[PDB]
Amino acid sequence: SYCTLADLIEQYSEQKIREVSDRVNKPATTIDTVIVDRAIADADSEIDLHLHGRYQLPLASVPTALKRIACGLAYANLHIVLKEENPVYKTAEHLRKLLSGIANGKLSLALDADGKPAPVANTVQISEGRNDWGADW
């Protein structure tokens, strides 16, 4: 859960979330929590797809850039039909580009609140090191 309904409302205003989330009432009246939850879950799943090879999956903290990316992807997911030239689609593409840059080691995952994220041990591995005759015998 890198973003919440509060984050979506704050980033896109409550009116737009209501309009793109209420599918049964015309005009919209309330925000459907289930739809928003599914959209946020899908955004988190995509982000994990991008970040699985460099960091641990169950992150204990959410970096701020991760919050922005999740909010953007979740909003893009709340559109049933999304054309290519829709600006929301372009924002989603830019965020996906940021994610790909992070995955390819060109961008670093920033601070969460004060501490660093938790990188995986992929680079750590070395055989073991056989150096007998060099132990001050």
Binding site: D132, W133, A135, W137
Partner: protein
């Protein structure tokens, strides 16, 4: 008495000293040469310096057994002595009794 002057008692000569130590005769060598590293060898030598000669003795036995060149050299050196003729001589300007004892 002996050469060192320690009192000698003929009572203790009837049985070997180690007879009352039947535990020793049942022991088996631990073979410390297998899986030996320079650190292990240094520890073995240092411990031997401090009075733990068991590990050092077993290591020396393994070393003798596992090296053909060293074993050949030691065997040649010892066989050199084993082939020497020997004799018992009386002390300097010994007397008739000393000559008979010799």
């Amino acid at each position: 008495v002996d050469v060192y002057g320690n009192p000698i008692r003929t009572q203790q000569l009837r049985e070997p000293q180690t007879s009352r130590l039947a535990g020793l005769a049942k022991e088996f060598a631990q073979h410390p040469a297998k899986g030996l590293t320079p650190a292990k060898l240094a520890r073995i030598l240092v411990e031997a310096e401090q009075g733990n000669l068991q590990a050092q003795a077993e290591l020396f036995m393994d070393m003798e057994e596992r090296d053909a060149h060293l074993f050949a050299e030691m065997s040649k050196r010892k066989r050199a002595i084993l082939g020497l003729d020997w004799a018992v001589e009386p002390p300097r300007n010994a007397s008739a009794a000393e000559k008979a004892d010799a």
